[PDB]
Write a protein that binds this ligand. Sequence first.
Ligand SMILES: COc1cc(OC)cc(-c2nc(N)c(CN)c(-c3ccc(Cl)cc3Cl)n2)c1
Ligand SMILES: COc1cc(OC)cc(-c2nc(N)c(CN)c(-c3ccc(Cl)cc3Cl)n2)c1
Ligand SMILES: *[C@@H]1O[C@H](CO)[C@@H](O)[C@H](O)[C@H]1NC(C)=O
Ligand SMILES: *[C@@H]1O[C@H](CO)[C@@H](O)[C@H](O)[C@H]1NC(C)=O
Ligand SMILES: *[C@@H]1O[C@H](CO)[C@@H](O)[C@H](O)[C@H]1NC(C)=O
Ligand SMILES: *[C@@H]1O[C@H](CO)[C@@H](O)[C@H](O)[C@H]1NC(C)=O
Ligand SMILES: *[C@@H]1O[C@H](CO)[C@@H](O)[C@H](O)[C@H]1NC(C)=O
Ligand SMILES: *[C@@H]1O[C@H](CO)[C@@H](O)[C@H](O)[C@H]1NC(C)=O
Ligand SMILES: *[C@@H]1O[C@H](CO)[C@@H](O)[C@H](O)[C@H]1NC(C)=O
Ligand SMILES: *[C@H]1O[C@H](CO)[C@@H](O)[C@H](O)[C@H]1NC(C)=O
Lengths: 728, 728
Amino acid sequence: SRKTYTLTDYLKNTYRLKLYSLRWISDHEYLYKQENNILVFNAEYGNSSVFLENSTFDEFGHSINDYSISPDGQFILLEYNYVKQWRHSYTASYDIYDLNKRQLITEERIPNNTQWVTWSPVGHKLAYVWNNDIYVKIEPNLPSYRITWTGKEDIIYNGITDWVYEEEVFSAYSALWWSPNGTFLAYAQFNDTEVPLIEYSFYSDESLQYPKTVRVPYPKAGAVNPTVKFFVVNTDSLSSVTNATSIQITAPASMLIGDHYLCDVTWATQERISLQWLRRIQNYSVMDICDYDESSGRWNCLVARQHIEMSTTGWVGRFRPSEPHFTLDGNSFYKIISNEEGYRHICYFQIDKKDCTFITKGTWEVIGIEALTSDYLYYISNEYKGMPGGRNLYKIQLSDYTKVTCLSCELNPERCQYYSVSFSKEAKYYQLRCSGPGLPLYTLHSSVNDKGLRVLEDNSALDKMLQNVQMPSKKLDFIILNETKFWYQMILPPHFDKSKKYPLLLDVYAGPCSQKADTVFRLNWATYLASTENIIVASFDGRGSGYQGDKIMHAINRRLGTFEVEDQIEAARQFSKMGFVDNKRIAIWGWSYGGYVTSMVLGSGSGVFKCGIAVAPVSRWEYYDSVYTERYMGLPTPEDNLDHYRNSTVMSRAENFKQVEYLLIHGTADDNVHFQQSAQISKALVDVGVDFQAMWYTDEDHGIASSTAHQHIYTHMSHFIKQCFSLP
Amino acid sequence: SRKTYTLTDYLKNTYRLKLYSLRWISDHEYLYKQENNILVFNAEYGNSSVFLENSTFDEFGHSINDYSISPDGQFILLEYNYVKQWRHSYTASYDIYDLNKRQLITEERIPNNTQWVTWSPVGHKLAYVWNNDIYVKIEPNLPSYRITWTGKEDIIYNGITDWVYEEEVFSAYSALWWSPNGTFLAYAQFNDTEVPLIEYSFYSDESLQYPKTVRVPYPKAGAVNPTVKFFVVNTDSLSSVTNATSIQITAPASMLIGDHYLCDVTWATQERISLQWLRRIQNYSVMDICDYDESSGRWNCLVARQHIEMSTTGWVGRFRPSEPHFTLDGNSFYKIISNEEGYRHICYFQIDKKDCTFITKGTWEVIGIEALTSDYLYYISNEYKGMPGGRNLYKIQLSDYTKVTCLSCELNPERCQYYSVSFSKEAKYYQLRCSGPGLPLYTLHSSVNDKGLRVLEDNSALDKMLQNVQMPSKKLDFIILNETKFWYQMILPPHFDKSKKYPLLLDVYAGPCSQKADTVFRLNWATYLASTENIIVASFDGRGSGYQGDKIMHAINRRLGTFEVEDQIEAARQFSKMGFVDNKRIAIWGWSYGGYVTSMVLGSGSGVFKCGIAVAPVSRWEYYDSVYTERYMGLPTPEDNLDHYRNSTVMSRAENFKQVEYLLIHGTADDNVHFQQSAQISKALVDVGVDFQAMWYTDEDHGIASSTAHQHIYTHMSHFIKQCFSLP
Ligand SMILES: COc1cc(OC)cc(-c2nc(N)c(CN)c(-c3ccc(Cl)cc3Cl)n2)c1
Ligand SMILES: COc1cc(OC)cc(-c2nc(N)c(CN)c(-c3ccc(Cl)cc3Cl)n2)c1
Ligand SMILES: *[C@@H]1O[C@H](CO)[C@@H](O)[C@H](O)[C@H]1NC(C)=O
Ligand SMILES: *[C@@H]1O[C@H](CO)[C@@H](O)[C@H](O)[C@H]1NC(C)=O
Ligand SMILES: *[C@@H]1O[C@H](CO)[C@@H](O)[C@H](O)[C@H]1NC(C)=O
Ligand SMILES: *[C@@H]1O[C@H](CO)[C@@H](O)[C@H](O)[C@H]1NC(C)=O
Ligand SMILES: *[C@@H]1O[C@H](CO)[C@@H](O)[C@H](O)[C@H]1NC(C)=O
Ligand SMILES: *[C@@H]1O[C@H](CO)[C@@H](O)[C@H](O)[C@H]1NC(C)=O
Ligand SMILES: *[C@@H]1O[C@H](CO)[C@@H](O)[C@H](O)[C@H]1NC(C)=O
Ligand SMILES: *[C@H]1O[C@H](CO)[C@@H](O)[C@H](O)[C@H]1NC(C)=O
């Protein structure tokens, strides 16, 4: 198709995928911003109109990062002066704008450097977090009510997570949950008082004479972890002369024994909250159920509805105990659980009753429960064609669980093997969004008789542009190792020719529960490598990999740096046998867990790879954080799993590097995998007399994502591979 | 046929230079350590005896790092548990061995973590520093007297210097100066209370879970400086329980007007000190003469007896106002000063008069006064044959200044052209140490008729080994640029042949008062480049270079990264117009200041260089320390010299680096030229999209000098030069 997909096209975004991000605001309407206008849509009919004009804030004077609309459609939150913190957190300013009038509010404004903000789920109350304390507004134009007074930077967090909770437990800065009435505000409070602090330089702009030292509470593995407390306050009982009254809910005594985590927080009904908890030695969690006592005003959790989950082979849940999905009345819920064969399925729980009933089962896994109505439960799994990297939507009749409908398997079976979904409030409508193998297709439907309504977006534009490029092809397949199947994917250069030998670059991640072999459509680096440089790009999902049951997933339990490393090697060997691969030119590379695995692979002495790149690699598990590391490794004590903690470092393999060409890269402001970790890799390579190449990116973190640094590192990595593979 | 000088020869020191390190101890004897027996030799006769048995200190229990023997021979200091700090500073433990007994003194020991210790000039009194306070012992087995009570880590330093004074002002950690009676202890006090701290990560051994932040009071250019007070205590009247009295000496009104530095302390007699002071703007310095007053017990500094040295053309001194050398009676003294043609010559001062009288003159410079007796002054200069990179000893008859005898020019004229020297007390004898161009040669001589006594080390062993390798040879000569002579050296491949075209490396330092072209013999990276890889390694002495007078030396005044930079560029061109260097393979490298200059050239756009390497470079003068920077740049304020501080960074030239292949190396624990400087270089290149190479050395500092990091950086640099020069 003559011209090729270029390094510059990736870096510059020549070919963009369209998306269709809607926001349901009721059971039959969604908002959609187009250019900078907000449109309101009707799902059953497809008519549409302008909710807010792109022009409405022309004379605002501050550039607008985002907006949130109140659920009654009365006000809109305006977020400007955004400042990124870590992966999810950030600070920003807010102005609220009243819709039925056309006024901004001068009165009682949210303060600058607000840390989190959220509207109640119904009405137009606001709850915010400033300076680490919680605040509530009953009406946008009124004075707020301070709910906490303990707030203190880096030590006391009311209503927002600290560094580990944010990164490894909630995946969010928020630690507030409104009851559905908007009556109650539950919230969480963290105390980092004794958490050791990571310290690193931040150089900033040229004009800064002295580098700033950044300092952040971060529990490295086996160190003191933050403590957590849970409160619920009643939002309809606030006063200006009287302080807010918070009712604490205590973890259960089976948690209280020792260090633990608050793991999940789910409103069931107006007067019932679910709370899930986990022991630090993450193989035990307790679901508690808490009720409001109208008279007492208290919240009580009855030890008899307490549910328990344990793992015999590993940790609990994929990354954490699953989310509970409650039936409307709050008396029962559905939740994904590993089963007696080790495959993850949905279990039905009745509240005061023992055991649970499996309503799905088989050799495959449910990825998620998506919606639950009186007559149906909706979920997603990789059942179809028995493909672990395929994803489809299913419908289960609740009156008879043997009646399962695939809503997605056949809409477009050659283009569409990998969907997600977004049901409306109450579920009378849904958007399907297919991600591959073909170009992303977004459709709307009515759950009534799963009728298709409209196409929303088909990226037809992009399909026509791509016709003019010589595009690679993606092969998705597997190899049988012991009597087991491990899946791999190859991205092949156009005009692929099994009669010719191509070099191969192995793209690895392979952390616990990962999947690097799927049916998704991507435009990315590997797109340029196979299209312009004609290199094959291979990913392999071996032991330790996810969505295929616990026997594969838990095989790496307490053993990081083994099975997952071995298997990547082995898959490369196999790839060789395959007559179309130059075994003198096989490489490896990876980011984050992937850098760690590539380094350990580069250091095995296998002989299989000529070279490899490691970006932001973990190098010794004692350096990464407690919640993630400990899930897999237990604790670094002689009494628990210290010996394998020490047997799995990159450093100890340094002499083996004399055998390969290695490129090691890190941002010096990485607040997640510390620059420290590659600093110790390079020093070990130095102590042993082994030459390597290196690159640091000053002031970048784990995502090395500024446009300038992102263009630069991929440009730098393109050169190193090109030259490793003798390619001009 | 012979073997070549390999990278491994250099790194492993296969070919070692022999030395002859001796310490004079009377006017006729010296100590010399041999087969680790300490020997005392007789200079006149050559004969030797065992001063301290090698056997002693075998069962001592620790390894001994150095030693120091009382002046009036009763005792010896043993240094162990040595732990280095910065360029000159360190901490250590101390044992004392009483010679006239076979005994280590067991009582009233010098404490561990001692910071500085010193015998008085006669007898056996001890002064030491511990926790930043000074202590005196009159006798080795008795209680010490505490002289200061104000010491405080990183804030108040008594009798030791702080970071800048160690590095830039006194070149030693020490700030104690005993009187010649040993009656008086003088000592400076530095106060760093409001000096900002540079802060950097230090990673240690892999077992350290969290990185430590190093914090060092370090004045960057234009910041607040430490301050200094100056004291003199009488060692003869100290009381058991009574607190000692230290009498203060005030800097003179013309310095107290603003910031200044103490730069020189020199005892003239038993009761007369000399202190030189220097303004922050280093244009004006003052010498004060203090006389002890029998009646008041005070020290008085007669204004009318002050001596003033200003500069209109630059700063004062080569790096700082020079040392005065006092006549035995302390009423006049000698000291190097820039004459009117701007050449540095010895000038004679009489204490209560006001001018001085020159004693040498000419279009060459004196480099140091080395010895003074009632009948002669001895100094080193570069007079011989007009070669400024040469160095020889001369003698001047005080009774007639034109009576000058060159003592070292004709000893071994082909082999020896770069001498230094070391006289006995009173100069009855002296060691000459030739450093090239041939193998170093050490001789002992008698002062009365200046006769050769013996050869002490001639490096014959090395002579024999070296006949078996193909050693490069050194060319030294000069070029004319705009009417003036500028010297360069070339290191040349063996069996060199001027009809062939060799690649050239330009090795640059080029700092103010530097000299990279001279007549000394070195075995170094360059030897290897020329002997194994056939690369001509050139160095050049441009404007700003030293030892050739102020017109060349001050031409860079207030303008760093200017002429010193154009000049290296011009020399390379000229080398290019040589019929034996190919202009396709000219590269350039340098450390420190030289890295700054290497980066500036690389970014000049000249087109002269294919590639270069910068190791630990300055990138922006606002980042380097006050004393040295301001010395040449003045202050970074708009009212002063800001504009050129802003115009002379490496970052500003980033866009040109696309024309060149650049390797940037910097240690992470560099307390001197901070890592931050390179961090900024690399960030500017990235912002602008230039690709380049990099290497960081974890925990190394400005010398990247641990044995493995040294092995590794030169290895790394070699691969990078060879490839740039297409050398297999
Ligand atoms: C591999 O691709 C992705 C994509 C993601 O979505 C952006 C998140 C992650 C992701 N998120 C996290 N919160 C974490 C936990 N720290 C991780 C992760 C897992 C393992 C390691 Cl060693 C490091 C990290 Cl960051 N990885 C990884
Ligand atoms: C040319 O290489 C050498 C050799 C030295 O003696 C071994 C000292 C120095 C030396 N000593 C010093 N005290 C200093 C003062 N900062 C310097 C120096 C000069 C300039 C710069 Cl930009 C940096 C340094 Cl470290 N360089 C340099
Ligand atoms: C859709 O059109 C119907 C009929 O006019 C109207 O009632 C409704 O408000 C329209 N909705 C939107 C969202 O534009
Ligand atoms: C926030 O800061 C801006 C500018 O500094 C100020 O004008 C605004 O009124 C401040 N506080 C708010 C928005 O409540
Ligand atoms: C946080 O924990 C520390 C240590 O246990 C305790 O002393 C401190 O008072 C706590 N603060 C709060 C508000 O919980
Ligand atoms: C409000 O309550 C908190 C504790 O609940 C207290 O510390 C603070 O001072 C109170 N102030 C008032 C208004 O009572
Ligand atoms: C040198 O020999 C002379 C002659 O005996 C002797 O007196 C002197 O002490 C000896 N000195 C040394 C250094 O051994
Ligand atoms: C010095 O250190 C040694 C061990 O290094 C210790 O035993 C001793 O008490 C310390 N104190 C001294 C000797 O001043
Ligand atoms: C050091 O200087 C600070 C002010 O810069 C002053 O407060 C302090 O007294 C001084 N300390 C001493 C012991 O001189
Ligand atoms: C010490 O000196 C003796 C006497 O010559 C020498 O022969 C021996 O090798 C030396 N021993 C040590 C430990 O160096």
